[PDB]
Each structure stands twice: as structure tokens, then as C-alpha cells.
Amino acid sequence: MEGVYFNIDNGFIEGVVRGYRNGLLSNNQYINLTQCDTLEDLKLQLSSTDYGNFLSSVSSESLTTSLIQEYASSKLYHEFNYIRDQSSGSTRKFMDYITYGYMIDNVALMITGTIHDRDKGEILQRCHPLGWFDTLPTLSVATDLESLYETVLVDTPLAPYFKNCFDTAEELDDMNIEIIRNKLYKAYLEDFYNFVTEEIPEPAKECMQTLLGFEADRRSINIALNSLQSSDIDPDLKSDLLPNIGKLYPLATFHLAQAQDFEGVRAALANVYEYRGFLETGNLEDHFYQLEMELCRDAFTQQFAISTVWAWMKSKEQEVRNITWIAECIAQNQRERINNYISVY
Amino acid sequence: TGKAWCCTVLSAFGVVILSVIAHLFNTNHESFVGSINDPEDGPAVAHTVYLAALVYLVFFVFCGFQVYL
Amino acid sequence: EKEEAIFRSAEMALVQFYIPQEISRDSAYTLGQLGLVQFRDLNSKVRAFQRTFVNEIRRLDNVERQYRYFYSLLKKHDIKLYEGDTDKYLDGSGELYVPPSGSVIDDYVRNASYLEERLIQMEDATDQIEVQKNDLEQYRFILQSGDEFFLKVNYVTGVIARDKVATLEQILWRVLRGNLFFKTVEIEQPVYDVKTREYKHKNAFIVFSHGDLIIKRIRKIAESLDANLYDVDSSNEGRSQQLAKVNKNLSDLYTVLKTTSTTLESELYAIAKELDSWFQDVTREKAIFEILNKSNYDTNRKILIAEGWIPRDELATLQARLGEMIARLGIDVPSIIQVLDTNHTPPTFHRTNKFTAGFQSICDCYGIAQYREINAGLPTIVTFPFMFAIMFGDMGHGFLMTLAALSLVLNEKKINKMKRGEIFDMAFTGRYIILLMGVFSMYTGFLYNDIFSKTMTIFKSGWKWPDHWKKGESITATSVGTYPIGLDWAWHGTENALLFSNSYKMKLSILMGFIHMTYSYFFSLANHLYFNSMIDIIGNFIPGLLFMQGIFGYLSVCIVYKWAVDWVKDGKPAPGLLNMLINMFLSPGTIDDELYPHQAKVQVFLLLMALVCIPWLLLVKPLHFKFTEDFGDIMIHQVIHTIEFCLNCVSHTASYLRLWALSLAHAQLSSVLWTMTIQIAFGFRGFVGVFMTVALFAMWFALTCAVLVLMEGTSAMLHSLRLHWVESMSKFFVGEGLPYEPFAFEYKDM
Amino acid sequence: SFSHFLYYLVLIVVIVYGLYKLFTGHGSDINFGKFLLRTSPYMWANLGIALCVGLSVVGAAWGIFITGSSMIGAGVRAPRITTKNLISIIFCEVVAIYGLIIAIVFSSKLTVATAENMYSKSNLYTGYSLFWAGITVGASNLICGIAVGITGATAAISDAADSALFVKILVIEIFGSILGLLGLIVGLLMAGKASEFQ
Ligand SMILES: CCCCCCCC/C=C\CCCCCCCC(=O)OC[C@H](COP(=O)(O)OCCN)OC(=O)CCCCCCC/C=C/CCCCCCCC
Prior knowledge:
This is part of a larger assembly, with chains A (345 residues), B (69 residues), C (750 residues) and D (198 residues). With 69 residues, chain B is mainly alpha-helical. Chain B has three helices and no strands. The longest helix of chain B is centred in the C-terminal third of the chain and has 27 residues. Chain B is elongated, with a radius of gyration of 15 Å. Chain C contains 22 helices and 13 strands. Chain C has 750 residues and is α+β, with helices and mostly antiparallel strands. In chain C, β5 and β6 form a beta hairpin. In chain C, the strands form four sheets. In chain C, strands 1, 2, 9, 10 and 11 form a five-stranded antiparallel β-sheet that branches. Chain C has a four-stranded antiparallel β-sheet with strand order 4-7-3-8, sandwiched between helices. In chain C, strands 5-6 form a two-stranded antiparallel sheet. With 198 residues, chain D is mostly helical. Chains in contact: A-C, A-D, B-C, C-D. The interface between A and C is medium-sized, with 26 and 18 residues. Bound molecules: 1,2-dioleoyl-sn-glycero-3-phosphoethanolamine. The site of 1,2-dioleoyl-sn-glycero-3-phosphoethanolamine has 15 residues of chain C, from α9, α13, α14 and α22.
């Protein structure tokens, strides 16, 4: 059963990670930040939290809503690499797959810079540090993809994921790069679905199939709406961008690819209750964030499951996104939407 | 230093324990020679142990001067 | 009329302070010099930034940051930091002194801000020079290498790290499609980076090719990786020519760096001798405002209002010191102090000396005691090392512990001044715990009669062998008398020796835990009679007493009675006590072998009495609550109390068998260690026999001092601790008390 | 796979061997009755005493690293729990004590018997009983030890969340401990009427 063999390898991990969640902020703690006046009062209050002295090195003028997002994120990443260090075996695989989705973003981000002729330093600062690999800045060399592939990206673990991508043009531009980026997630989210079904045991298996199904469904919806900006795209092409694991597959991914307008999308999502009313009312992106937290809140009801590492990151990322929103509103003195923060804990 | 204190306290009680032992073999104390598997001749073993204690006594006085300086 | 606070916690009082706003800053220094007062937080609902002294605290928080910056640059260099008088302020004995001014503190601000502007510039004028330096040395080192390096623009050349030397080489194999011509040369001494702050091994590479398009991609790949490309002319004239220009500028550059680097360090020697006296005088200005931030601030009047706990004995000294403070000032102030009586939980405080402190620091780990209850620290002075010595139980290994600690006791003045590690603290913090674990182990070993696995032969023996026997004939001994003190030495070497000792040490262990448990259960009573809780006596004490005494006292009375009967002479058969205890539950009224008359008529009564005490323990106290949802909370706490108390009387009594087990194990390892090592040498003679006795004794003595004292001592010591935290203290120790952490200044190590 | 293939290649030899003897009129040759009679009752009695204290130590040592590995992780942020959650390590150790009380009781019943009266009604009875009683106490305390470790790894995590919740989960941890005490009782009832070897 669950707890009989889990603790041999991952007992210490589970305890630290469930201590990292108790430092997640509550609704009462977000209010105390809300009624602050300046950023010097926003610093004193997070000292009372589990953030502590993450800004002790910093003076009055040096405070910005940019420098706060940097040191709140950098505290998540040291905690991640600490846990990934202590891990071994399947748990070390699981924690490497989580990082393969952050370097896909950085591949697409270095390349678009070269098309606009910018310096790597100016770009590397805008790169996410969990998606780092040794030959990342070497992608600044060439624009042809097959050049970039053979010389650099073969050694990477991204090599299997470029099969369906050798249709690029001799010249390379924004809308071509985005199509590449979406083919990778299609192959990444299908390899990391089968990996869980084979090696990762229950009940974490049941929970990660769900959490990865939401990541798939969320993309298939955005990729369709972005296409409405475009002039026209063949239907069989979009079929090569939409993954094949969620609730939408197979019935609705058919009717999404063949959606010419917003109404044609609602005709496709109406036959699924989980996603029925997002388009109908309110901001779309907030509806997903509120459903991500609810699924992660339910992963912590379990025990002896390695899915809490996924749940923990996504929770604390949204924590960071709320801090910055509150911080901008304070400096800019706009306080109409300061209560926009998303919290389930 | 500790390289010298070690053989000083060690060889301190080697002089003491081995001498108390040799006294008993010599006097043929029951616990040391009473069983058959114990040695047959008491004082012969004491003669061998009186000398062994002197060897520890030399290490004691030598290392005493070493630490004393 | 000063009280002692070891059997029970000290009595405390709650006091109120009417401080004017003028002398608030000055009074707080004096209260910190005492170290007697523990302040409550009155402004507990106010948010952290809405508090009033927050602006004064940021001026001082910024200063501490600026000082952390200074201590970093120091440690970045080999400078040592000056250490001033840690006693010039106080000696820790509650003495008075006058505090700094408000203008001195405002000078630390502008000074510290003024120093940050200079050092931050002097460091960057230094680092930028070192970058120019490292670039040229690499440009110089490469030129030293000969022409073979340039044998096989024609070529590309530079410097790179050893770690990125294979990654670069693979890629260039892929670009050029095999037509690769690559040479690399190493460097042995690492290179210190100034931004990355690391020492780095490096190499120097070179690449050959003729295509113009192909070089510009080689130059980007090498620069995408951290590599610094350099120009080198192919002639052996253009190399020495450039080399002279470089070795010239480098000689120039040594002087330019040498001047600025020294102008930098000169400023630090000023800082390094007036730093640890500024840092202290700032953290103490912090400390008082936080105290003053716990206080309410009247806007109608400058009176500050505060609250604190103080020991009732230490009150007349408080009134005294403040009377002295007002004297030098010359102000007329009304009575600052008013004693306040209100329902709160005061803090718990026990006065400890050097002898009681280590025993008290053991119980405080498990929990802080409730206000005015029996302390678990007085019994622990004796019962902790005596349980150790039942297990340990040897005159040799105990005499060694006694010396090891008696060196720490006599040199304590020398040791306390000098600085200590982390292991050597606890050996010093418990230097009196180890003294008593040694003395008692010489008593218990004498009774067991074991000295380094052997026996003493002090008295006459109560056993006698036959007048005549022969070799190999199993012989039995006949009784004469009783041995006065300890186990008789006739058992030593005997075939049936464990059958006697195992039976003996079990019955010791069962009797010595029953006394340890009951004595700690009469501390519940002593509390209930001090807080006037009559119902808990009739509810909890009297029923639980009858439960276990009727079961586990009947066992202990029968062990003492069976030992006191001559069964063989009388002709009756001795009964087994394990079966007698089982059958009384399973099959009352039945006996197989009798221990005393009317055995069955008394057993069934004791069974009757225990079963009555279960529901009387279950029901009596909640009914009193109802008679006077909350009634449920009084029940479920009372229904769990019994199912534990009854089970735990069976699992605690069984736990005390570790007294027997760790004793038996310690004894056998000692004999096996003697029988393998020293017993062998005695069977040799000559010079070769003399040498083995010298070699084998040392290995006996070393394994003895390590395996049988340190490894076994630390095991048994922690099992003795368990029997206190889990078995004894469960009977009476409530816990969840508030500690006593007064406000007092101390030296902060930085 | 390989390990599962052998389980199915054993089952197929026991069947082909049973039917060889049966169809040939030799099914009586596979006689379990003689094996129970002719085997020595000291074998059965010395396995049970070993499999009691052995299988009880497996369970105790098991629960100590489920409860111990979570406390130490939880104790990083809440170091105050390692002495409050210590009670879970105590109910896991105590099932080993139960397996050592038995072995004290049963060792008394190990006596030498004459060669003529070795395979008697009473000495066979006494070997069968100390075998299944040892199995009973050992295999039952193996289960009570693993269970209490799972229960007590949660109570460490809940206590680090909030001090109040620790008390509420102990009730689950007490009921689990009853399993080891019942096993001890059942074993003593089996070996109650068993008599030492004559
Ligand atoms: C396993 C084989 C090796 C064994 C090596 C043993 C070496 C000798 C170790 C010292 C043993 C004797 C001292 C122990 C009793 C006294 C302990 C004591 O007073 O603890 C107090 C302390 C509270 O105060 P402090 O944290 O000290 O801080 C304030 C101090 N003013 O108490 C507690 O923490 C509660 C628990 C007490 C019992 C703890 C015992 C732990 C023993 C660990 C031994 C470690 C040995 C390491 C060997 C490494 C060798 C290179």
C-alpha cells in the first residue's frame, strides 16, 4: 500500500515539502499587505511571514516591484534545487521532467531575440533559471533550425521532441517559432504522461494524470483563440499542435480545430461541464488559475505521494504573482483591483 | 600533546593492572589458576608479566618528560 | 527571606509602569541592566507598520546593514577583527551605568552612511584594475608557448575553462564536418574571478581554418561560451614585440593597483578597531524601542503604560534602582510602580546552581512546567544516574568515568574561560551528571561483584564444595550460610550461572520500576492538595491507585514472600509467578500450587476491585460537571485518559526490563573481550610472550575505553532518560507552561 | 517474468508428480501424517521462539523509519516536535518487548526427553503449539508495527502544522496498539496447557 515502501527514499523529502507549504500565505495575511502604504511597509510585513530577511541587504531607494519579484522567485529556486539534490531514482527523473518545460520557453526566447538582433546578456537576464543548460547561449549563433539542431540541441534531452518540426522555412520568424514551441509541449506532455503511468505508483499516478490533463486542456483552448487573430489555417495543421491526453481528447479537439470563431468554440466546450462557463463570463486567465489552485489544494489531502512537489511549486508561483500585483498597485497608487489576488489557502 | 598523553595514561594503568594481575598468579589465586584450562604454573606467568609492566613504565616516564617540557 | 525555587516554581507578580515620554528612553536602559522583567505585548492587535516607534527602528536597522557590509570586506581579506572589553558595560551582576546620548547615535548614522559611499567606490576602482590585469596575463601566458602551438586569418585562438573544453570541441567537429584541427594547452594554477568569486582552472586553445564565413561562426561559439579571444601574430618576431608591450604595461599596472589597494586597507584598519564597540551600542538602542513598542501610548498625556512579570522577592530592589535613576536626573516623578492583580498565567522560573542546572536542562527539553507544580528536576538528580548504574554496573568501567569527569570539575575555571566546541560543551555542561554515574556504578558493580569481568573474594562464601572429587566430574556445592554483601563469588565460572542471575535481575527490575512509578504518582496528590482540586483526588487518584497496586503490587509482594520461604525443607513445591498472574484473570478460584492460605479468596476480590475502578474512573468526574457540548469535552478527555492509563500500566511495567537486558549484554561482551585478548597472552613464554602481553593489553584497554564506556554509556544514558520522560513524568507532569525570558543585555557574537 | 515463471513452474511439477503417483496406485506415498509424526518436536519449538522475536523486531524497526524519517523532515521548520512526537517511537518499540516476554515463557518449556517417550502424545502437542503461537505473536506484531508507523508519520506532519491536531490523531494510534496486546493473549492461551518435554 501507500506508506509501506515510500519512506525508504522519499520520507525526508515529503516532510520538508509539507513544511514549505505551511509558509504559504493565508487570506488574512494578504489583507495585512493590502492596507500597506509604501514598499518600505510592505517589506516590514513579510518579515512576519516565512520570507523573513529576504530583503535585508536592500536600502530605501533600491526597492522596486521588479527587485521584489526577483528575490521572491530566487528563494523558490534554491528550495527546488535543494530538494532535487536529495532525490534519487524515479524521483530524480520526475524532477528533471519538470524542468524540461522551462527550457522549451528559453529556446523560443533566445531565437526570437536573434531575429531582432539583440545581445545575449540583455536576453539571458530574461531567461528562467530552471530552464538552463550549458549550450543555451550558443543558440544565438544561427537562424536556420537544422543548423541549431545538429550543432547544439542533439546532445540535449529535447532531441526526441523535434520529429514533427522539420517543416520550417529557410528563414525563421515569430509565427514560425511559436508553432515550433507548441509542437514541443505536445510531445513533452505526452512523454511525461506515459512516464507517470509506467513508473510512478498510486495514488500520485491518479493525481498527476489529472494535473497534466489540465495543462493540456488549458493550452488547447488558448491555441485555438490565438488562431482567431490569424487569417486562415488548415485544420489538419492545428491537429499537430493540440495534445492528446486530457478530457477534451478526442471528441472536442476535433471540433476545436474546426472552429472559425468564438461561437464555434463554445459549441465545442459546452459538452464538458468542467470547462463549461469560463468563456461565458469574466476574465479567462483568472478562471484557470482558480482551478489550478483547487486541484493542488486537493493533492495535499493525500499522503505518501510525490505529487506534492508539483503542487507546491505551482502554489508558490501564484503566491509570487500576487505579491507583484499588490506591489505595483501600491507604488502606482491605483487601488481599484488590488483585491484581484487569487488564494485558496 | 595528544600524541603523548595517550601513551601516558595508557601506560599509567598498564603498570597498575598488570602488576595486580602478576601478584595473583604468583600467590596462586583460585580465580586465575583454578580451572583446568588455566595455566598450570602460577609464578612462571607472573615472571613474564612483571617484565611486561616495566616496558609500559619506560613509555610512561619518557612521555612524562615529553609533555612536561 | 529570599525563597528557594527548586521543589516548586517561584512566585511572581504583575506590575504596571507609568512612564513619562521624556524619560522612557532612559528608564528602558536600567530595566535591561537588571535582567528581571518580562514584558507583555499590550499592542497585540496593531499591525507591524502601524506601531509608533517603527520610524526610529529603521534608522538603526539600516546601520546594522551597513556594518554587515564592512565585516564582509574584512573577511574577504585576511584581516582579523579587534576584540574589546566585553565587561566594560557590565559584569552580569545587575550593576547600574549611564547610557549614551541621542546625539552620539545620530553620529553613527551619518558616519556609517559616509563610510559606505567611500568604500563602495574604493572597491570598484580596485576591481576594475584587476580585470585589466587578468586579461593581460592570459594574453601574456599564451605568447610564452612556442611555434608548434601554431603549426598545424589562418587561425583562431583564446583562453577557456577546462570544463567547457570538450563541449566546444564536439560542436566544431559537427560544424566543419570532420575537418577539425584543434590543439589545447593547460594551466596548473587556478584563476580567481572577481565577479563569480571562484578559483578556476583554465586552458588555452587554438583552431585552424581558411573560410571567412566559417571563422565568424567559430568566434561566436567561443564567445557564447565564456572565452576571451586574442590576436597573435604568426611570426616569431611579432610575438616578442607584442610581448614586450604587454610585459611593460603589466609592470606599470602593478604600481597602479599597489597604491589604490593600500589606500583601501588603510581605511579598514580604522574600522577594524572601532567596530565591535559600535555594533553593541546600536543593538541595545534597538532592544529598548521594541520593548517600548509593546507599550500603549496615551495621546491625552505623555504617560506610557506597560506591564511586566517580576518575581515577588525581587521587587524591593526594583523600587530601589529606579529611586537612584531619578536621583541623578533631578526630576520630581510620582510613584512609577503599581502592583496589578489579574487572572493570567505567570511564567515559570526555577533558580538553578551549577549542580542543579544540568539536571534541570534535561526536563526542560521535554516540557516547561506549569506554574507552582512539582518540579521533575529534584528526583532526577538521583534517579537518572542510579538507573544508569543498574545497567552499566561495573567497578572498572565506572572508575574510568569517575576520572574523566573529575578532570572537568577541577579545571572548570580554566575550561570556562577558554573557548569550546559543540561536543565538548555537553561533556562540560554535564560534568556533574557523569560524576554520579560513576560513583553509583562502583556501588552497583560491588553488589554484582564485577570488576573488568572478574570477581572479588572479600568475604567467606555461603557455599561449599565436596571434600573430595576427581577430574571431569560434575560437582555441586552445598549451602553453609548467606553471603553478606553482593553475589557470592562461587557463581563465577559456574555452568548454571545465568539461570541464577537472570532470575535475580528480572525481579530487581520489576520491583525497582514499581517503586519509581508509585512514588511519582504521589506527586499528583501533592499538587491537587496545593490547588484545592478535591474532585480529582476522588476522581483520578484513588481509583487509579487501586487499579495497579492490586495487580502489580500483588506481584511485588509475592516476589518478596517467595524469597522468604524455605520451600525444600517444608516439602511444598515452589509456584511459578507468571502462571499465577495469568490464571487469576483467565480462571479465578483455581490454583495449581499454593503460595499462601486463602490465595483464591483474595485474588478474586482484587479482580473485583480493579473492575469497579474502571467505570468509577470513567464516569465520576463528568457527572460532577453536569451537576456542577462542553459536557462532551469533559467526557472525551476522560474516556481517553482511562484507556491509556490502563494499557500504559501494562506497557510501562514491561519497559523496565531494559534494566536487565542492557546489564546482561554489557557483562558478556566484557568477558568475551577478556577471553579473546588477554587470556591468550598468558599461554606464552619467553621474549615473544612478553611482547604479546604488551600488544594485547593495549587493544583490550582501547576497545574497553571506546566500545564498553562510550558506546555503551551513551546507550544506557539515553534509556535512563526515556524512563523519566515517558514513564515517571507521565504520572504527574502536566506541562504547557510559559517560560521565563526576561529582558537583559548580552554580548552578541556577530 | 522470470520470478513469476518459477512460481508457475513449481505448481506444474507438484501437479505432474501428484498424478504420477495417483494413477499408478501410489498416492499414499505422499503422506503428510508421517512427516508430522517423525519430525522432531524440538524443530517446531525452536522455530517459533525465533520467528516470534524475529518477526516482531522486523515490524518495530519498520515503523521507526516511517515515523522517524518524517519527523526529521518536519522538524526542520518545527524543531519543537521531536520530543512531543516521540511517543510514536515508543508504541513501535513495545511490540518487540512482547516478543521477548513470550520467549521467556516458552524457553522454560524446553527440556530434555527420554528417547522412548520422545514421540508421545504430549511432546508432539507441545511442539505444534509453540510453533503456531510464535507465528501468531510474531506475524501479528509485524502488522501492528507497520500500521503504527503510518499513523505516526501523519501525526508528525499535523503537529508541525498545528499543535492542537496532535492529540486528535493519537486516538488512532492507541487503537492500533491493541492489536499487539491481543496477539500476546492468544499465544498464552494456546501454550497454557502445553507441558514441558518429559
Ligand atoms: C556513539 C559512540 C560515541 C559516543 C561519544 C560520547 C562522547 C561524550 C558526549 C558527552 C556525554 C555527556 C554529556 C551529556 C549530558 C549533559 C547534556 C546536557 O546538559 O545537555 C543540555 C541540553 C540543553 O542545553 P544545550 O543545548 O546544551 O544549550 C545550553 C547549554 N548551557 O539538553 C538537551 O538538549 C536535552 C537532551 C539531553 C541529552 C542529550 C544527550 C546527547 C548525547 C550525544 C552524544 C554525541 C556524541 C558525538 C561523538 C562524536 C565524536 C567525534
